[PDB]
Structure formats: structure tokens, C-alpha cells
Design a protein around this ligand. Structure first.
Ligand SMILES: COc1c(C)cnc(Cn2cnc3c(Cl)nc(N)nc32)c1C
Length: 209
């Protein structure tokens, strides 16, 4: 297991997200779904010029999986996935500029719900999650598990779990007071409100209870 420091700017963003009083936490789902939609668009586009990129799975979709036993909400997609380089360096690099702009915007009167406009919507996960575990598989790279409970560090390891074929699983380990996001009717409400025109099937799994 390798342990890495976030760049200071990203640590700062995560702190702001965790510490700021902001009631409209539900926007985290829309951001993650948007991210999944963008990853699906990317693999779809690449497949037009190299069809073998779908040898790791032709189906392009999103699954939302609540688990009350584990207190997790998992957002799964069969998008392009992330390389080791994405996890350790590239995403962080890109996020530095978006973070600065977002911070500036917040000082000028913007609110947290606008985070996606700055390309750093993933970190809104921390509105509701005490820990985020990301399982990902990109073509021509290995399956990785990234994890962070914030605090300035994250880990990356090669994943020995169920092989995914291609895609990303964002596993939200929900805060004790955020378990409404495990409830079917609440997830349906939020998807209808903020994610109604996504161009891929979104399947909301039901709890076995
Ligand atoms: C490791 O966790 C992330 C970090 C630290 C920053 N951004 C994203 C969003 N993100 C970036 N590329 C992504 C792809 Cl291909 N797919 C999805 N679903 N989300 C992505 C993720 C998941």
C-alpha cells in the first residue's frame, strides 16, 4: 500500500468541503453521476476509432448500490476508468487550477453547489462520506484501489478484489448522520431532480435488507 500527500491546494479544498456549514449536501450524487457520464462518453468516443477498447465490456451504464449493513453508497460505471498515473498525479494536477478558481468564486459569493463548474466535483463526496474508496480499471493498466479519509493523504494499492473489466466504483463510506442516502426514495428523488437527462442507463439497486 503506497501513501501519498495531497497537494496543499487539494487538502485545502477537502478541508473546506468537510468544515463549511452547507446544508444542501445532496449535490454530491449529481457530481459523481456527471463524472461517470463523462467517463462513459470518453470510452464510447475512443471505441469509434479503436473498437477493441470495448473488449473489456460493451455495456455503458451506471449503477447506484446502497448497502445498509456496510453503510455505503457505491456509484459504479463502465467508463474509461483511471490509470495509476491519473490516481497519483494527473487528476491532482488538473484539480489545482479548478480548486483555485472555485475558492476565488466562493470568496466572491458562489456556493458549494457550483463545484462541478470548476472540474473538482468529485471532492463533494466528502460532504457525506467519512471515507471514499475508489476501485478503478483502465484498459492496459491494472485494477487499483485508491482511498482517502482526507487528513492530507490518500493511499493507492493494486486491487485483488472482484475483477471489474473496465470502469470505476466510487464507494462512499457514509458519515453516521448521512444515512438518508441509503434510502431508495431519497436516491430516486435526487436523481430525478439533478440527473434526469444523463445519456446512459442508471440502475438504482434495492437493498436486500
Ligand atoms: C480517485 O478519485 C478521484 C479523484 C481523486 C479525482 N477525481 C475523480 C473523478 N474522476 C476522474 N476520472 C474519472 C473517471 Cl475515468 N471516472 C469517474 N467515474 N470519475 C473520475 C476521482 C474518482
Amino acid at each position: 500500500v503506497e501513501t501519498f500527500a495531497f497537494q496543499a491546494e487539494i487538502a485545502q479544498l477537502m478541508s473546506l468541503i468537510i468544515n463549511t456549514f452547507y446544508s444542501n449536501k445532496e449535490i454530491f450524487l449529481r457530481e459523481l453521476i456527471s463524472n461517470s457520464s463523462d467517463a462513459l462518453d470518453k470510452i464510447r468516443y475512443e471505441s469509434l476509432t479503436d473498437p477493441s477498447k470495448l473488449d473489456s465490456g460493451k455495456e455503458l451504464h451506471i449503477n447506484l448500490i446502497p448497502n445498509k449493513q456496510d453503510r455505503t453508497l457505491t456509484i459504479v460505471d463502465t467508463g474509461i476508468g483511471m490509470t495509476k498515473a491519473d490516481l497519483i498525479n494527473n487528476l491532482g494536477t488538473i484539480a489545482k487550477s479548478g480548486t483555485k478558481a472555485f475558492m476565488e468564486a466562493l470568496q466572491a459569493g458562489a456556493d458549494i453547489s457550483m463545484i462541478g463548474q470548476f472540474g473538482v466535483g468529485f471532492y463533494s463526496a466528502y460532504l457525506v462520506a467519512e471515507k471514499v474508496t475508489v476501485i478503478t480499471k483502465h484498459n492496459d493498466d491494472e485494477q487499483y484501489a485508491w482511498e482517502s479519509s482526507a487528513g492530507g493523504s490518500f493511499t493507492v494499492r493494486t486491487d485483488t478484489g472482484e475483477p471489474m473489466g473496465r470502469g470505476t466504483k466510487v464507494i462512499l463510506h457514509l458519515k453516521e448522520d448521512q444515512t438518508e442516502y441509503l434510502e431508495e426514495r431519497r436516491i430516486k428523488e435526487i436523481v430525478k431532480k439533478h440527473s434526469q437527462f444523463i445519456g446512459y442507463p442508471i440502475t438504482l439497486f434495492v437493498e436486500k435488507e
